[PDB]
Design a protein around this ligand. Structure first.
Ligand SMILES: O=C(O)CCc1nc2ccccc2s1
Ligand SMILES: [Zn+2]
Ligand SMILES: [Zn+2]
Ligand SMILES: [Zn+2]
Length: 100
């Protein structure tokens, strides 16, 4: 995984409501393999379910998404996982919600 990418500038502030790692897909309602968009904080499912987060990337151009299964961050433009200081706050808020 990359230690930086040129889309980190599109990571937006975390809503004051926080994250809900059990939130369903906003399109199909599945509870399985969802991701949260780090630009607009909508929640959509992964490629192995109904691919709604990939569709969101296509229709918005939003680059970076966070996995609610393992808290990895994927960039659709770079086609890589990214770790950076700029992702720690949102990873941490998710980790707290997920693990208690
Ligand atoms: O839409 C999703 O499932 C989330 C982002 C990812 N897409 C790929 C594609 C190939 C390998 C790893 C990943 S993580
Ligand atoms: Zn879905
Ligand atoms: Zn988005
Ligand atoms: Zn990138």
């Amino acid at each position: 995984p990359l230690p930086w990418c040129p889309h980190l500038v599109a990571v937006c502030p975390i809503p004051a409501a926080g994250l809900d790692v059990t939130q369903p897909c906003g399109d199909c309602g599945t509870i399985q393999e969802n991701w949260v968009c780090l630009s607009c904080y909508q929640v959509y499912c992964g490629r192995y379910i109904n691919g709604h987060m990939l569709q969101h990337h296509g229709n918005s151009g939003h680059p970076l998404v966070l996995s609610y299964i393992d808290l990895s961050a994927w960039c659709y433009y770079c086609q890589a996982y990214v770790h950076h200081q700029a992702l720690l706050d949102v990873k941490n808020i998710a980790h707290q919600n997920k693990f208690g």
